[PDB]
C-alpha cells in the first residue's frame, strides 16, 4: 500500500477566470431528497447576462485521503430498504419510476424527467451509476442528449504513478471530461482505481480483462472464467460504473483478422483472441454472458460492449471482421436488455471520412439504437503526434450522425503513455468535436455558447471572450504574447491586423456612419 | 535560418523527376521527397513543397522558369495566361510540370485549366516558382498566410516563416502584410518562395493612403496592382463582390463584416454612396491580369465571422456576384478561384459547396476553414480542421489554414507550423474521402511500419518526424526501444500488436 505524494491541480479560479461553480437545487418528490445539480456560471462585463454552462469539474480542493462527499448514499439506502430484485436505472425506468439519478440528469440536460426515464427504459440512453460509487454526480449518455466525452487515464508497467493518475483524473474533469476510464496495466491496479473512484465525481469505467491478465502474471493462456469473475466482483464492489467487455470477439471471427494490415489493435480483444486460439475454445466472456449480466444488474454496472476487432489502420476500416463483431454486439445488447442491464456499444477506430456514415447506419440498426461509443475515429494514419486532430475530425463527424460518447485520443496515441498535458489537449480537442456535433444536431440552446463568445469578440470585451472559451488562460496568454498590457484588453484591435486594419472596428465605423446618414 | 531539411525529415532525400517539354525541348525537374525505409521495404515517394534548400535569402532562388517565359514572349501572343494557352490547345511547361507532380495526364491538366475547373497560379515575373495546380480533380492543396502588422514582426521573421511554412507542406502562401516595408518584405518572400505567392492588393493600397479608407480610389488601387504584378505576385484576392447594395444586409449580423479587405471596401462605398470600384473596374483589372497571368481569387468580403451569421443573405448575395465575376473573368482568359467561408456549423457546410459548385460554374473553391464552432479561441486550427476536412471531401480545392492564434494575435513561427500540420491532415483526410488515386499509399506505409515496430520508419514517414520521435522518447529514450515490440502506453505484456504477432505465430503452426 503506497503513500503517494499528491500534487493539487491548478484551482478552478486559475482555470476559469470570472467563473463560479453553481448548483440548481431540485427536490425528488417520491423521496423528498434534495438534489444539487452542478453548473458553471461565467460572469460577464458591460451588463451582459451571465452565461451558464455544463460543469464536470466536481467538488474542489478535496483532500485525496478524505475523498469526495458520498452524495448518493441516502438514495441508495432508501431504494435498498424498499426492496427490489434488480438495481439498475433501466429496471427502475421500466417500472415507471423516476429515480434521483434520472431527475438529476434531466435537470443537468434541461430536459423533462419523464423523457429521461423513457430514453433509459427503451435503452437509447444510459446513466452509468454503480450503487457503490456514492461520490458520483449523475450524467446521461445518449443520442438525444449532449454529446459526451470520455478521457482515458491509468498507468502502465513502464510509466506513471498513483499520484500522477489521481492528478490526471481531476485535471481531465476540470477541462470537461464527462467520464473517465482507468486503464491501468502496471502495479497497484486495485489501489490506483480506489483513489480514482473516491475522488471522481464523473462515471469511472474499466476493462476488467486487463487486471485479470495482470493477476495471472501477463500470461493469457492462464486466464479463465474464475479469475475474470473474481475481477468483475472486485471492481464492482469498488464502484466501477461501467465495464468494457470484449464478448464479441468470437473464436470463428479470429481468422478474419489474418490479412489485416495492423491486425488486432484492441488490447482486450487481442487478449481474448490469444486465449481462444490457445484452447480452440469459445470466448469465455461470451460463454458466460448471462452470468456477467446477473452480476451487473445487482450493482448497476453498465456494459460497454467492446469492439475487439476494430480497425487499427485506414486499410482495415469497415472490413469483414469489424462488422462480424458488430452483428454479435447487437445480439449481446438485446440479451443484456432482457436482464435490465444498461448497454452502450463500442465502435472504431481508424476510419476514413467516406466510410464513417456506414458505421453509424449499421450500428443504429443492428444494435437497436443503443448508445454508440467511438475511439475517434482517426481519419488518417499519417500524423502520429497529432492524433487528437486526425480523430477530432472523425469524432465530430460521427458525433453529428448520432454517436453519444466520444472516447478521446491524445497527442501521444501510438507513441506512449499520455501525461497531464496530453490529457488536457485530448479533452479540449474532444470538447470541440462534441460541441460541433451538438450544433450540427441543432441540440437545443447549443448555439447560445457560440453566440455569447462571438458577441464578446465583436464588442472587444476581450476578458469576457477569454472567460467564455473552452480554455480561457490559453486564449489570454496567446493574445498577450504580442499585446500584454492591461489596456490592450479593451483595444478595438489585436496584433493580427493592428488598429488601422481591424475589420470589426471598421464595421463599427460603418454602422456609426449608417446610424447617422443611413445606408 | 530555418532548421535543415535533414533535421525536419530524417531518412528523407529531396529528389527530382526529369521530363522534357517536347515543343520547347526544355528540361523540367519536378520535385518530390523520398523516405528511405529499413528492412528492405521500398522507399516511399511523397509530394514536396519545401523547394531548393540552403539557398541564402539575400541571394534568392534560381530563376528556373526564365527560358520558359522568354521563349513564349519571342513567339508573340495577345495574352499570357495558362487558360489562354490551354484554350489554344497548348500544353505549357507549367502544365506538364503539374501533370508530372500530380501523376496525371498532361492533356487532362490542360482540359481542366481550359474549362476553368483548375488553375496554375504562375505570374511570368515569378521565375523562382515550382508550378503547382489547384483544382477539385487534383490533390487538395493548403495555403499558409503570413505577413507583418503595424504591431508585430519584421522582414527577417516573415522570410523565415515562408521557408518554414513550405518546409511542412504549404502549397501556396499569401503575404498579408499591413505594416511597414510592405514592398520590400514581399520582394524578399517572392525571390525566396518556390510556391505561389498571393496578396490582397487593397491592403497596401490602404497603407499607401495612410490607413484612411476614404482616400482610396481606383487610381491608387491600379498603381498597387501593377506594382505587385511586376514583383511576381501569382494571385490577387479582390473583393469586387462587396456591392454597395449588400452592405445594409450586414446590419443585423452578430459579428458584422470580418473580412479585412471587405470591410475596407464597404467603408469606402458608404462614404461616397458609390459602387465598389473593383467591381466597376473589373474589366480593367482583367486587362492587367491576363498580361502577367495573375490569377484572381475573388474574395468573400461578406463571409460569416460567427456561427450565428452562417449562410445568411449577405453571404449568398456575394456568392451569386462571385459567379458573375468568374464568368466575366473567363471571357478574358483570367484564371479564377472563389473564396469561401468562414464560420460555418457542420450541418450547413454541404449547402456551401452545393451552391458554389452550381452558381460559380465549378471554379476552384478556396475556404478559410471553415470553423465549425466559435467556443475555442487558441484551438481554431482544430475547430477549423474539422470544417476544412469536410468541405475538402465535398470538393474544395484550396484550404486556407487557420493557426492557433486566430482571433488572438499575429501568428509566430510555431503557430505557422501548427497551422500547416493541421491543414495537411485535413487535406489528406479529404484526399482519402475522395478516393484520390494512391492517396492511401501513405497511410498504408506508415501503418505497416507501425505493425512491424519499425519505429524510426514510422517517425520518418509521418507529417512531423521529430515530434513523433520526441513524443515516443519522453518515456522510452534508449536506442534499443526503437526496435521494441511495445511502447510505454501498454508496456511489453499488453501491446496488442505484439499479441497479434503471437496469435499469428500460433496459427501459422497449429492453424485457426
Ligand atoms: N493507460 C492509458 N492511458 C490513456 N489511454 C490509454 C491507456 N491505455 C490504453 N489507452 C488507449 O487505448 C488504446 C490501446 S493501445 C493501441 C490501440 C490502437 N492505437 C487503436 O487504434 O486501437 C491507446 O491507443 C489509447 O487510446
Ligand atoms: N499577417 C497575417 N499573418 C497570418 N494570417 C493573417 C495575417 N493577416 C490576416 N491573416 C488571416 O486573415 C484573417 C483576417 S482578420 C479577422 C478575420 C476573421 N476572424 C474571420 O473569421 O475571417 C485573420 O484572422 C487570419 O486568418
Ligand atoms: O481494450 P481496448 O483497446 O479495446 O480498449 C481501449 C479503450 O478504448 C475504448 N474504446 C472506445 C471505443 N472503442 C474502444 C475502450 O472503452 C477503452 O477505453
Ligand atoms: O481580406 P480578407 O479577410 O478577406 O482575407 C484574409 C485572408 O483569408 C483568405 N481567405 C480564404 C478564403 N476566404 C478568405 C484570403 O485569401 C486571405 O488569406
Ligand atoms: S485585429 Fe483582426 S484578428 Fe484582431 S480583433 Fe480585429 S479583426 Fe480580429
Ligand atoms: S504498446 Fe499499445 S500503443 Fe504502444 S505500440 Fe503496442 S499497441 Fe501501440
Ligand atoms: Cl499503436
Ligand atoms: Cl477576430
Ligand atoms: Zn490506433
Ligand atoms: Zn473568425
Numbering used by the authors:
A (entry chain A): 77 to 595
B (entry chain B): 84 to 595
Copy the relevant paper text:
We prepared two different crystal forms of AtThiC, each containing the substrate analogue imidazole ribonucleotide (IRN) and the SAM analogue S-adenosylhomocysteine (SAH), which is also a competitive inhibitor of ThiC21. The mode of SAH binding was unexpected. In the canonical radical SAM enzymes, the SAM amino and carboxylate groups anchor to the differentiated iron in the [4Fe-4S] cluster; however, in ThiC the fourth iron binds to a chloride ion, and the amino and carboxylate groups of SAH anchor to an additional transition metal site. The conformation of SAH is also stabilized by van der Waals interactions and through a salt bridge between the carboxylate and absolutely conserved Arg386. SAH forms two hydrogen bonds with Glu489 through its 2′- and 3′-hydroxyl groups. The adenine base is sandwiched between Leu259 and Met572, the N7 atom forms hydrogen bonds with the guanidinium of Arg343 and the amino group forms a hydrogen bond with the backbone carbonyl of Gly230. In addition to the amino and carboxylate groups of SAH, the metal is coordinated to two absolutely conserved histidine residues (His426 and His490 in AtThiC and His417 and His481 in CcThiC) and two water molecules. Zinc when added to AtThiC at a 1:1 molar ratio during crystallization largely displaces iron at the additional metal site. IRN does not make any direct interactions with SAH.
ThiC, the enzyme discussed here, catalyses the complex rearrangement of aminoimidazole ribonucleotide (AIR) to 4-amino-5-hydroxymethyl-2-methylpyrimidine phosphate (HMP-P) in the thiamin biosynthetic pathways of bacteria and plants 17 and is an example of a non-canonical radical SAM enzyme. The CX2CX4C motif of ThiC varies from the canonical radical SAM motif and is located near the C terminus of the sequence. The homodimeric structure of Caulobacter crescentus ThiC (CcThiC) showed a (β/α)8-barrel fold and suggested that the cluster-binding domain, which was disordered, resides near the C terminus and inserts into the active site of an adjacent protomer through domain swapping. The cluster-binding domain inserts into the active site of an adjacent catalytic domain through domain swapping as previously predicted.
